[PDB]
Amino acid sequence: DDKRFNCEAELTLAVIGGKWKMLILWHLGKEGTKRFNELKTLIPDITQKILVNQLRELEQDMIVHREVYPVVPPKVEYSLTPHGESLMPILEAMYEWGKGYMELIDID
Amino acid sequence: DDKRFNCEAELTLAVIGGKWKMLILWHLGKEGTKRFNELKTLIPDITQKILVNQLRELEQDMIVHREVYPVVPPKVEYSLTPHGESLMPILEAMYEWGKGYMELIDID
């Protein structure tokens, strides 16, 4: 029970934690499917290497779908899986909470 | 905007992150006010030193209220602040998400 709450809430933190995953997921959930360069533009502080590593981890974690489309020209699209989509209410609530908290700590 | 979503969602992660804060907050929000020894019993894997450090950080972060009551015998009670209470829906949703995710990764 207590271990079940803790193992499970901590798993969630591990999946979305870090400096850029929440922002990647936010753009995919709010705006939809994106190519790599589109995400790279939306997140100007991120490097190619870091964005590739974060997307790879999100894909291996079954949060992001990466699909290759052999059309003319070929393209690779990134999107949320159903598991990713159900993180979106959590990210929304974290943003709303942190918006209010930041004002608290900033203005003091 | 993008920096505002990111700064703010990341602040939230910093406040609740780690191995024991979510569990401390969960017990305080679900069960109410607790003394230190009560929390120590509810979280048997935690050490005195670690529980003192986590509660101190939660208090300094204005998530947990620590009140000394000079009654007979004196007592020190820990509870959530209003800012802590508004984390509870987020923790609830993280637990529900991670419960489903753990089943996904366990059963495979």
Residue numbers in the entry:
A (entry chain A), B (entry chain A): 5 to 112
Copy out sentences from the published article reporting this entry, exactly as the authors wrote them.
Both FA-treated and -untreated HxlR adopt an overall topology similar to the previously reported MarR/DUF24 family proteins that bind DNA in a dimeric form, with each monomer consisting of dimerization domain (helices α1 and α5) and winged helix-turn-helix (wHTH) DNA-binding domain (helices α2, α3, α4, and β-strands). Our study on the FA-sensing transcription factor HxlR revealed that FA induced a specific intrahelical crosslinking reaction between residues Cys11 and Lys13. The resulting methylene bridge (Cys-CH2-Lys) on HxlR’s helix α1 caused unwinding and rotation of its N-terminus (“N-terminal helix-flipping”) that allosterically rotated its DNA-binding domain with enhanced DNA affinity and transcriptional activation. Taken together, we confirmed that HxlR uses a gain-of-function, intrahelical crosslinking mechanism between its N-terminal residues Cys11 and Lys13 to sense FA and trigger the transcriptional responses.
Particularly, helix α1 does not break at Cys11 in the HxlR-K13A structure and residues Cys11 and Ala13 are located on the opposite sides of an intact helix α1, indicating that the absence of “N-terminal helix-flipping” might be the main reason why HxlR-K13A does not undertake the conformation as HxlR-WT-FA-DNA. Further inspection at the N-terminus of HxlR-K13A revealed that the sidechain of Phe9 is located between Trp29’ and Tyr99’ on the dimer interface. In the absence of the “N-terminal helix-flipping”, HxlR-K13A can only adopt an intermediate conformation between that of HxlR-WT and HxlR-WT-FA-DNA.
